[PDB]
Amino acid sequence: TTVFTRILDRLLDGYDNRLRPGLGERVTEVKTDIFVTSFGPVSDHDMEYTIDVFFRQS
């Protein structure tokens, strides 16, 4: 209904994305985790390896 659109519109009022949360009052904690869908091939000549991941932060 309309309340979804109204809330979506009103979220970014006076929001400066240039500043991290709690800039100058606390430390931004990021909870992270990874789901490796496939550990890709390992190239010995290039000494590299490919990995495909669902990478989720919070």
Added chain:
Amino acid sequence: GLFHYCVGSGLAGRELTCRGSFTDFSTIPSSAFKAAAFFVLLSMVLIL
């Protein structure tokens, strides 16, 4: 022929698409054609 075959597209023009080869038995239309081509090749080998 024994293995090769050309067919027309059917647009009042020749455009005879040609497919088939004894060297590739998959392209031969039927097993009878394969057997006949093999027998004719064997006859040619014998006379040579």
Added chain:
Amino acid sequence: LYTMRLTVRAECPMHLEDFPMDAHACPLKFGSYAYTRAEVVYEWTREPARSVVVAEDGSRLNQYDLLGQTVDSGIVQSSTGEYVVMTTHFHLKRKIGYFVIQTYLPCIMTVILSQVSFWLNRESVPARTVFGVTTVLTMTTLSISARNSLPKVAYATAMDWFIAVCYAFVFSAL
């Protein structure tokens, strides 16, 4: 909550002294680029072991066996500040059967051939001469083929030492 799907090519330094019997711990390290330890800190959502989950079918490795993962966190002190770095280490062990069947075992049989020359009568000079020199040629071919399938490292790998010793053996037999 911010989820992404990524494909990452990442550096894995390798100590190929014990090739093909070598094992590696390839790292995957990440962290904030701009924000230092005093601004942004990363943590694992769950216990660190269970916060990196590998799918059951997700091992697309030909010559390696993915034994497991080790999840950790640390600090890096760079020129611009201290940064939290969250790391995982995937433990890989090489499969040896290919190099056994293709390189080690033909070399062993060629050395056995070069040693079989001693059981021929000494008066068969052309036979033993051709036999030894062709055995040397066979070792040359095998060594070339073996080293075609290695990275261009400087120091000597284990299989290089094996090939060199076998080549010296056929030389000494001749």
Added chain:
Amino acid sequence: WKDERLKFKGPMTVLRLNNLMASKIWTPDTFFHNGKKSVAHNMTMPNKLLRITEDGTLLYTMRLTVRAECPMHLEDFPMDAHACPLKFGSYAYTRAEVVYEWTREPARSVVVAEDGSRLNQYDLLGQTVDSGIVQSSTGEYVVMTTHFHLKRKIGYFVIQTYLPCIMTVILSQVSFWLNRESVPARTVFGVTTVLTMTTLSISARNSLPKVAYATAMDWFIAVCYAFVFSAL
């Protein structure tokens, strides 16, 4: 070029514009006729510079890595020489609208750095700069042409291909000086020299562009192979 629309007055004599304003100004649509996938470097920032003099004279400098087609006739390989071209001009504007010219004399308007030669096989003998007209269905277009003359270095092929083949032929001919009763020995010369020539031929043509026609190296290899076969 000159643009009377962009005439200005002030304490300045030259004004340099950033990318955002420079993109809002007409510039020539120059393209390379024989070009390929080319790179306009933008590290750290877009490597372009637009300057305007007070009298509306626009100067536009760019840093490019032009990758261009150089047709080659490798019949005389490795003794071949080439004149790799570099042709460019306007895409949309015909000769009646946009005409290109060289800022200085044509020989002096394409300047090559002394240490710039990054060639491994070739030697850059010189350059020929010219101008011309190309006629198409869309119209007639001015084309600025350059031709860089290249001469292939021969020493690598001499040491890797010609000399070993010559010495293999000499080895095959050495068999004539042995007693005729050493039948296995002379057979061994003949057949092993044939095998050596085969290996040399395969290796020699392995490191060469896969042209279906015959080069000079191919003729030399085949003729040496013919001598070795004739010796056997």
Added chain:
Amino acid sequence: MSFVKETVDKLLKGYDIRLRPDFGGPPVCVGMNIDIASIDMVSEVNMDYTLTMYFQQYWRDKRLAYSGIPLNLTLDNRVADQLWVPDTYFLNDKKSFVHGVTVKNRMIRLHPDGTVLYGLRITTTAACMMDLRRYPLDEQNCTLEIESYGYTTDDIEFYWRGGDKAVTGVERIELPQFSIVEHRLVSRNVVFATGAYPRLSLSFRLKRNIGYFILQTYMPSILITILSWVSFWINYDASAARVALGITTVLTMTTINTHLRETL
């Protein structure tokens, strides 16, 4: 956090990206730092080397100075589009890019005195003309040249921040084929006809390692040559043996040379 927001709004408001710091004044001095993450593909075929770096530029801009906030303002990277940044470019690069996962690896950090730090994670292939006549017993000089595209020394000046400590991470580099004997930094003004243009140069001296070639190429050649001398100790009448030995040594040497040509 709010006071920081109006401070940043004040700084960015009325900011002209088209004008450099001290536009009418003396030249802006741009200090430079590099942290070498890795040097990967030292290619003899292509005459270039691939290098990953954290490349930092420091310069004072009085317009961005602020007061009342005793902390270094690390801003979101997109603000780099709103600020003036130097005209820096690598003269000898062939293919370069900023790493862009998860975001563009940029960093903008403002300081209360007006200093601006601009950091980029750059992987670049750079041309390194190699004189491989003494190969594999060869030493190469591979350089990275840094220059200003559209500014002269009267407008912008480069220097290595921290002196010889400006470039770090070289000690931690190791290559499969090479070893970094030495690295040097030099700052100089190229006196071009229009004017003097600033330039920095980071050079590495790479020495190739011969453990590869002592085993792969030299030892089989030496031992085949030694085996070729066995013919002298065989009786002259044993034609088949001596001929087979000599010609098969020729064939083996040809095989070694051809396959070495293919691999190298």
Added chain:
Amino acid sequence: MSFVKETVDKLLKGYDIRLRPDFGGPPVCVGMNIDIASIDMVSEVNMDYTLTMYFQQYWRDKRLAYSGIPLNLTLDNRVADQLWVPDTYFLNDKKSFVHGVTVKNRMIRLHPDGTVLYGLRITTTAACMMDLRRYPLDEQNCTLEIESYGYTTDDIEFYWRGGDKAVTGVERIELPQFSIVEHRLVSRNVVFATGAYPRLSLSFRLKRNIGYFILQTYMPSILITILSWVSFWINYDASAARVALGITTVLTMTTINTHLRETL
């Protein structure tokens, strides 16, 4: 044309791209259609295959319903930026792109009842786990998994449009090394703690052709072994002949084995 322009303006005016069709209603049913243009590469080393296809999605949007125009409006592809489309993605993808010559190879077709048809020409490299222990006598199964990134079965539902005939052109594919024995389509819902996510799956079974390996691997080795058996019919005292035959057969087998190693 003026009436069509006015109608399209009304349809696009007030359209909220953020809101799916029937945002509070039942889930939007998306019917997926594929036309396989070509299977380009099948890399055993990288464990993947490249696939070019025309990928089409059909759904219903009441907001995009118009009357008085008895024809299906094929609009310029750029309007896809102004319309909601499913958040479809390919789970086993390694790299993919939409072709962009002469323009973006994309199709938007509206219908008077509000049915949107959304087509894309896609070249995608898809991972395919391979069991090559029986190589070259192996039969691989390579799949493409289509899924919704953000939506669950409460919001979006997938189905194959046309049933088993939803994927076409497979029989027209020809691969030099493989043969498509059979292709299958599956439509399921993977159930997780967050919810049930719809998935479609297009599977192929590739049978590797053996004629290449018969010609280049098996017959040479068989004939060299048969020739090596010739020594048993040669006199025991002819040491040079029998030894040369045996050792040259060994050398030939080594040569075949090595060349098969670098060529395969």
Added chain:
Amino acid sequence: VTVILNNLLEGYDNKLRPDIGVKPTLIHTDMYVNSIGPVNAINMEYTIDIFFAQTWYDRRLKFNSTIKVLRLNSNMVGKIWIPDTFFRNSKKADAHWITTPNRMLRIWNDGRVLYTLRLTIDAECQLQLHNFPMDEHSCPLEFSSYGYPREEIVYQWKRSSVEVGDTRSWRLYQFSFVGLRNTTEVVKTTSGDYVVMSVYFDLSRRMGYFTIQTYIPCTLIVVLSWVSFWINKDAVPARTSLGITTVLTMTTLSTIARKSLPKVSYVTAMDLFVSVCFIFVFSALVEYGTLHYFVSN
């Protein structure tokens, strides 16, 4: 002239083709081939560089003035409706953007629009590699509108449909350009019937490489295998070494036959020739073996 362009763009909807509710939009296409690049038989594709031009009519862009033609660079290309033309069999295609976008737009006072652009296309070409290296092919290059069926867009060839340059500057290594032809068809798909248009380039392989490096060596090795018959009997080491080393040389020669080709699972002419030569040298060696066995006892 700025007034003319502003008037033309004023009240213009580029989302709608001309004659959207009236008739199909007729487009006349022209091609100038700068170069047919190398043919990758391994991937079964070939590179081609073209100037592709499309001419159509848009009455929305009519203007009355003394200019009679507006010649423009790429700047307005995105501001008007352009056809949805795409190349059906292109594995990879790229436009050119150095120094600027290589595009051109010319609008006449009667509403005619000519839109030209430079393209490089890696077009798929399925090669029937029987008779290799005597094989000949007709590689296609197809294109059609991606979205608009025949009822909405209809392409057409002009009199000077496809033009080619010198053809000696081309990068055809293995093949020689024989000829060219064009065709128009209607292809039925799920979306609808689309007017597809094809340009077929006929190519024939050159044989200097394969004659010098494969056929002549194989023939000479077969002759050297025959030489064993003229060696005196009881010279067992000589004849055995000759036969077996000829077999080894033939084995070495047979490796380079398939370097050009992909891993096709059928015999080619070259494979047949090499196989027959191998049979001949094998037969010579087995013949001497039988002779020696039956003469010894």
Added chain:
Amino acid sequence: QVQLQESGGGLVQGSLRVSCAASGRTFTTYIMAWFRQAPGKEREFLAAMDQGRIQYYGDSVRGRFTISRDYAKNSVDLQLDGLRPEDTAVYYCAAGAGFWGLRTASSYHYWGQGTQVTVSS
């Protein structure tokens, strides 16, 4: 032979610095770490640094001990601040690529002689 010589004090009332010089092999690519062994035969991980200058620490000594490396000199240093009596133990310098480890002694193939450190109150 590869040796890891260890240097530093053994008696403090306090701050200390335990250095470790490696000879016989270049440990640029290897993870250089410090372990502690108190009486009772238990080896405890303290700190480690990898090729990327990334510092891993044990929970017991987090924020107290600082590990650094001199890659040119091929050495690893451990600065110990805030010593308490229970820190009295033998400190071992270790090196080796961390396989299945980076916190387990079994992953390190090189070890030093050790240095006894005592603290008295």
